[PDB]
Amino acid sequence: GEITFDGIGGLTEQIRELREVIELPLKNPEIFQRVGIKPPKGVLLYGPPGTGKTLLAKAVAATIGANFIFSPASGIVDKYIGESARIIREMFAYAKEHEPCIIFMDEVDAIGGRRFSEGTSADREIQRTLMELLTQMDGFDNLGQTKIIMATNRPDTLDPALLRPGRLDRKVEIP
Amino acid sequence: LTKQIKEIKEVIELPVKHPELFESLGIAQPKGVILYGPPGTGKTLLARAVAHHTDCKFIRVSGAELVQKYIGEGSRMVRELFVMAREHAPSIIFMDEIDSIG
Amino acid sequence: MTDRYSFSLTTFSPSGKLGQIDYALTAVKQGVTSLGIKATNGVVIATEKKSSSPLAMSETLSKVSLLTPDIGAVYSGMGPDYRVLVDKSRKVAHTSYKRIYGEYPPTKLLVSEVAKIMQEATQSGGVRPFGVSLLIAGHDEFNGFSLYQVDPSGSYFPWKATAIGKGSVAAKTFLEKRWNDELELEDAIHIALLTLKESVEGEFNGDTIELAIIGDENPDLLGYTGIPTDKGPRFRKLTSQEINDRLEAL
Amino acid sequence: DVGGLDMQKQEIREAVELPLVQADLYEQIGIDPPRGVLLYGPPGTGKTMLVKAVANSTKAAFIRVNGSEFVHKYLGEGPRMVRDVFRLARENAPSIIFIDEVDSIATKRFDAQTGSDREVQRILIELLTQMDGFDQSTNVKVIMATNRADTLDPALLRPGRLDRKIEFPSLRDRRERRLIFGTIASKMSLAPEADLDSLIIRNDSLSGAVIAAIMQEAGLRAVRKNRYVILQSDLEEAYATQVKTDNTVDKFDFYK
Amino acid sequence: LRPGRIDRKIEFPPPSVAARAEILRIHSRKMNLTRGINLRKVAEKMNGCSGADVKGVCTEAGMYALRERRIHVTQEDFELAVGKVMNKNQETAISVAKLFK
Amino acid sequence: SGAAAASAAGYDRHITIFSPEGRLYQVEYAFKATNQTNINSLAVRGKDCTVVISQKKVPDKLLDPTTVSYIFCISRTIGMVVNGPIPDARNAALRAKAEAAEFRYKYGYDMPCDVLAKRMANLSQIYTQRAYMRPLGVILTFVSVDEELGPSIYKTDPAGYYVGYKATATGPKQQEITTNLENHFKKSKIDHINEESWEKVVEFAITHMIDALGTEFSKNDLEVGVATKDKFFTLSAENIEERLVAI
Ligand SMILES: Nc1ncnc2c1ncn2[C@@H]1O[C@H](COP(=O)(O)OP(=O)(O)OP(=O)(O)O)[C@@H](O)[C@H]1O
Ligand SMILES: Nc1ncnc2c1ncn2[C@@H]1O[C@H](COP(=O)(O)OP(=O)(O)O)[C@@H](O)[C@H]1O
Ligand SMILES: Nc1ncnc2c1ncn2[C@@H]1O[C@H](COP(=O)(O)OP(=O)(O)O)[C@@H](O)[C@H]1O
């Protein structure tokens, strides 16, 4: 809409700063290249439980004028046991041709599963579902018409096999 | 070192090469050795080298290949070893062992 | 995993080793850097002052402290286990030796009377030891100048040029790259501050540093001019400005 | 793309690049190649990234993994790992390995009065076994990373296992400090009144990771100032950012 | 460790000096070995307290020639090898000063 | 990982046990007690006059507020304010008030706050050597107007650390205050503060623990001390009514 309402309470510098973290790479990002730097392919939003952040990220991408979509990481592994990662790539292609757009996805600590806890060939779903995530987000080129958000409570429980170094580069706690 | 060798080929090869002798000498064949000393002396060398000049086959188990994380997956695995020896008899086994630590 | 031969002191482990001492010597290595090296005609004793807040007057408390006029000290590690130590160290000069020999003691017999004040607290449970260390340094007139270390175990390794604390081996690596046999004090003094410019962060001025010397008598500190033989102290703490020029000579 | 770090680079080109594309060198002389190395020295120092470049020239495969993963609670769920990777690091040969931490699971111990820590030996003794026992020769696998080297087992340092210690700066290497700034700066566009020589000596301790935490905080606020180009004054507010004394979280309550 | 399972056992000790000399000739059979060598001496200049540290030595010697691009060596290229495996084992982990008599 | 091997493997209930990190933890757990009141004092210097301020809360109405106070006149020329529970403040207050005395019986003059912070802190060390006594869960401030040093503030914690600040605060809310006078001093570069009168220096220190504290204060929610040569005492309530009229 580019003029949407977001006036719930609790937090101001966050909504103030994500506006800095995320607005400029989307609206006129032809400058991040010639200046020299590479912008952040991704984001992570961690904190304690029971805080109402699902609506937050839903909101601030709505005032800015970005096409927002959101899917938990449950049904993709609850409804779809071993036919999951097909949904991932479709969730981006659909997202691509509707560029620009934002992602949001909670319960992200479910992709781990075993996290190769034993390397047996029975958890291929719990393994590959991380793979197709990473290969796809690397495919963006980080131009400025698609960005990504993730969240959970236990970032110490996270899977830094990826999503630590340069993918979910900016980590942001919350009060 | 070569004296060390002479005990190996006394126990290993003689009961295999021609053991009619012991029936004359009136004693029991032997059935194993063990070799100790610090690292960096060339003991795991030798068992690589004994293979070249056997005429009988060879089996090797570094420790920690036995363990398989279930209750009896290990003790089924040792037994799956020896039967694979007898049919392929004769045979030699070589082992770094710390499963028998403690 | 734990060890069950470390929560107490009077227990030996199969390697014939004791529990808590090994960790006290780690309580100091986590502490700040302090040192003292030696020369032909004097001894130097140095450290810094990592002032916590800006509002703490870093002058109302001295890392260095006088034990006798000819003997001074410095720690590295914990603090309160220093000013509780010295207050019962300098006494022992005035109690065990002085009053029955007239004069202040040598430098090593002082150490023996420290290190058992250090070892009284590592022989019975109900006592943590002194999580500190020390570098006693002084002079006397049959064995000469000296330097000495004192660990919490009660052992006193002697030394020539040494440091302790976190920034130790970086410094000890550096001393013999610069140390000699025939060195003189005012040559051995700018060494012992350019040793400390590496093991530091931020400001490096007289108000973030303090050190000492040993030398020939400083009778102007004495107070009672009129005796021919009572040559006064042999220990003087260098003021700020007396340091704060040498750096600009460097 | 890396900064400077000249001779450290020179030594792994000897240990790693040559044995993969050049072998008659080591043959005719009358010797065998050295096996892997380790890279000791404080963190945020370009250890891991160097090793990545090494792959990028030599084109060989690459396996990155961390030492806190070999440890596992189910008995034998660790040494299955250390043996599993080699089963494939041969397969996709020529191949090498990097381990961003091994001091964790590697440290001398006088004995084990415990069940858990005994398995840590069963981990290691298989690792030490795979290289030294019979195997292939194109793997140069082990590149042990750490933060110190005064802790490992000398039985790991038995020549044949590891024979090329390697060291990196910690601080006060002003030369290696200034040398990277131009490199990162060589990537970015700056105005001529944008001198960095004010920055180096002003410090007394930092590393090579922070500088990127500075540059990507230096050339981040220009755009906040909606300029196509950067200036100097943006910088000075950064060096305080990636500086010391963020907060005395538990600095005083520790010992005293 | 009973008989009936292991009927004898072996001690592999580390070698003498005249012992080690043959350990080098086998590792050096493929090196070039310039003339004026007395490798009965190099053993004595440094007892390889192992019997495999030498295997790094005879390797390490040639590594100098690689750096220089020379193919062969002499006695000198050994006499420094001892400086690494032996001294740098004493200058490796003897770096404490705190100890108890 | 920080206290995980602490809370499990002992190291948190005996005083005299080190951890392999070197840290002993019991005394490092004492400080959580200092903030069990949600209270926040202050102290500053003068030309010759010193001041210390404290809140004095508004609990249930049944109290007799004349006696609720964390300001203890120790001797003359000396005073102190605590940060922690009341009972573990008395035993420090009283072990002192019978310590300045014997000095004056044994050395011929009154102790300064130098020694009085070095003595009482030379004790809280000891009680972290032996198991005589749990270390008193406080952190206490001293004040004085000495003859040889002028004004002087000092401070003491359950380990034994003591330094004579130039100005300071304490409690749950140090960062907010401490900045609202750290920045003040770098303006003027005066360890002390101007405004000769012990009156006019109060109103300086009040207003800084209003703007940076977080609310507005009456006369009853406070209690305030002061040190001047020959004396130490407490105060009345009008000093703020003669502030906001001027503003
Ligand atoms: N006499 C020798 N001849 C040739 N090589 C030797 C000799 N002695 C030692 N070595 C060298 O020592 C190494 C083998 O060491 P050794 O086999 O004794 O350790 P290990 O037995 O593998 O230890 P563990 O079995 O406990 O893992 C080889 O690299 C080998 O070149
Ligand atoms: N800052 C807030 N403002 C309004 N409601 C909130 C806030 N924080 C939490 N909530 C309440 O909590 C619920 C949302 O929390 P939830 O989205 O489950 O948090 P999380 O996504 O971290 O699990 C809603 O019912 C909402 O009313
Ligand atoms: N000399 C250098 N040149 C370029 N980048 C450097 C340099 N030193 C450090 N870095 C930066 O440090 C980061 C990697 O640090 P790393 O080597 O992973 O630390 P560690 O070795 O402790 O894992 C990279 O982002 C890289 O840009």
Residue E56 to residue D161: CA distance in whole angstroms: 10
Q: Is the peptide bond before B90 cis (omega within 30 degrees of 0)?
A: yes
H/E stretch holding E62 reads helix E53-68
Angle at D215 between CA D210 and CA D220, to 5 degrees: 130
**Chain B contacts in chain E segment 44-63 (CB below 8 A):** 50-53
Using CA coordinates, name the residue in chain B closest to E51: B41
CATH of F10-247, one of 2.40.128.20, 3.20.20.20, 3.60.20.10, 3.20.20.70: 3.60.20.10
Give DSSP secondary structure letters for F150-191. EEEEEEE-SS-----BSEEE-SS-HHHHHHHHHHHHHHH--S
**Containing H/E element for D143?**
strand D143-145
Residue A1 assigned to a binding site: no
* Ligand 2 center–CA A11 separation, angstroms: 12
A 10 A CB-CB count for D119 gives 21
Nearest Cα residue in chain C from F160? C80
**F157 touches F149 (CB < 8 A):** no
Query: Which of D156, D198, D201, D149 is CA-nearest to residue D174?
Result: D201
Is D46 annotated to bind ligand? Answer: yes
Chain E environment of D14 (Cβ under 8 Å) = 66-67
**Sheet-wide strand order for F140-146:** F71-72, F78-81, F140-146, F150-156
Do the Cβ atoms of D77 and B40 come within 8 Å? no
Q: State the closest ligand 2 atom to the C-alpha of A49, by its place in the atom list counted from 1.
A: 22
Closest CA to C67 of C229, C214, C228: C214
A155 labeled part of a ligand binding site: no
* D41 CB near ligand 3 (under 6 Å): no
D2 lines ligand 3 (CB under 6 A): yes
* Angle, in degrees to the nearest 10, between helices F174-188 and F198-211: 130
Q: How far is the CA of E50 from the centre of ligand 1 (A)?
A: 9
How far is C-alpha C41 from the chain's CA centre? 18
Cα of D47 to ligand 3 centre, how many Å? Answer: 7
Q: Which structure tokens are listed for C28?
A: 């100091």
With touching defined as 3 or more inter-chain CB pairs under 8 Å, the answer for chains C and E is yes
Closest atom of ligand 3 to CA, residue D176: 1
Residue F141: strand pairing partners: F81, F155
How many C-beta neighbours within 10 Å does residue F9 have? 16
Shortest Cα–Cα distance, B82 to chain D (Å): 22
Q: With contact defined as beta carbons under 8 Å apart, do D222 and D233 qualify?
A: no
Helix axes D210-218 and D174-187, enclosed angle (nearest 10)? 40
Query: Which of the residues E92, E96, E98 would you substitute to probe the C interface, choosing the one with the greatest number of C C-beta atoms within 10 Å?
Result: E98
Give distance in angstroms: CA of B42 to centre of ligand 1: 3
Q: How many C-beta neighbours within 10 Å does residue A54 have?
A: 13
Query: C1-249 belongs to which CATH class?
Result: alpha beta
Q: Are A and C close enough to touch, i.e. 3+ CB pairs under 8 angstroms?
A: no
Yes or no, beta carbons of D256 and C31 under 8 Å apart:
no
**Residue nearest atom 9 in ligand 2 by C-alpha distance:** A52
Q: Both tokens of residue A147?
A: 């960005």
Q: Which amino acid, residue F82?
A: V
Nearest CA to ligand 2 atom 24: A52
- For ligand 2, the distance from its centroid to the CA atom of residue A56, given in whole angstroms, is 9
Question: Could you give the CA distance from residue C79 to residue C92 in angstroms, rounded to a whole number?
Answer: 20
Q: Which ligand is nearest to the CA of D2?
A: 3
Identify whether the C-beta of residue C231 lies closer than 8 Å to the C-beta of residue C219: yes
- To the nearest whole angstrom, how far is the Cα of D172 from the nearest Cα of chain F? 27
Experiment used for this model: cryo-EM
A47 is in an annotated binding site: yes
User: What is the identity of the amino acid at B101?
Assistant: I
